[PDB]
């Protein structure tokens, strides 16, 4: 990165734009009794942007501390098998690398992502996007995260709880039926909420 501030500002604004997309652009992909996942075509690659929403029985600052790159995230997130900080820019901005266990016959991926955590209304946004990175490790497929992130705000009807909204936009690469991508993305999102709720 040549200009970290400009990059972070563009990423944050992209996520705020996603959070403004109207409901007729979304199609339901998976619905459980306390998480919903929607999908729409991505403007960033040949695949899809996913949105997840669900309530968390905690307040915003501790939730985002659990989600942002750090030891807590690696501990409770069952799909994540490693987490490294590659470069720090500020207290709230870094480049990190994380790896995922395989699922649905898709082999382990690694992602090298810019990460940025910032205030948003009465809550917080933790957003990310993949970056170019030289360390090529044959043990992992380098997947690519297009703009993604987590909004966490007080639940409008009960602010002792929080509303957690996620956007994920991952290119897993390789030959994978979109059905298996769909299942992986929706299962990853619902297990994310499940694991986070149990961590708190």
Curated annotation (Swiss-Prot):
SUPFAM superfamilies: Bet v1-like. GO terms for cellular component: cytoplasm; cytoplasmic vesicle; cytosol; endoplasmic reticulum. GO terms for molecular function: cholesterol binding; cholesterol transfer activity. The keyword Transport applies. The lineage of its organism: Eukaryota, Metazoa, Chordata, Craniata, Vertebrata. Involved in the intracellular transport of cholesterol. Binds cholesterol or other sterols. This is StAR-related lipid transfer protein 4. Residues 1-200 form the START domain. Signal peptide: none annotated. GO terms for biological process: cholesterol import; cholesterol transport involved in cholesterol storage; intracellular cholesterol transport; positive regulation of bile acid biosynthetic process; positive regulation of cholesterol metabolic process. Keywords: Lipid transport, Lipid-binding, Transport. Transmembrane segments: none annotated. It catalyses: cholesterol(in) = cholesterol(out).
């Amino acid at each position: 990165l040549s200009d970290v501030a400009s990059f972070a500002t563009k990423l944050k604004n992209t996520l705020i734009q996603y959070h403004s997309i109207e409901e007729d652009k979304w199609r339901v992909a998976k619905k459980t009794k306390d998480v919903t996942v929607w999908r729409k075509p991505s403007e960033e690659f040949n695949g899809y942007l996913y949105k997840a929403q669900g309530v968390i029985d905690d307040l915003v600052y501790s939730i985002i501390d659990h989600i942002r790159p750090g030891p807590s995230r690696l501990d409770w997130d069952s799909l994540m098998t490693s987490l490294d900080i590659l470069e720090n820019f500020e207290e709230n901005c870094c480049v990190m690398r994380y790896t995922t266990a395989g699922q649905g016959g898709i082999s382990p991926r690694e992602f090298v992502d810019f990460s940025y955590t910032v205030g948003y209304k009465e809550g917080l946004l933790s957003c990310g996007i993949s970056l170019d990175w030289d360390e090529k490790r044959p043990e992992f497929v380098r997947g690519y995260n297009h703009p993604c992130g987590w909004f966490c705000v007080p639940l409008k009807d009960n602010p002792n709880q929080s509303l957690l909204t996620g956007y994920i936009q991952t290119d897993l690469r390789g030959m994978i039926p979109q059905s298996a991508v769909d299942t992986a993305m929706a299962s990853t999102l619902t297990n994310f909420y499940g694991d986070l709720r149990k961590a708190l």
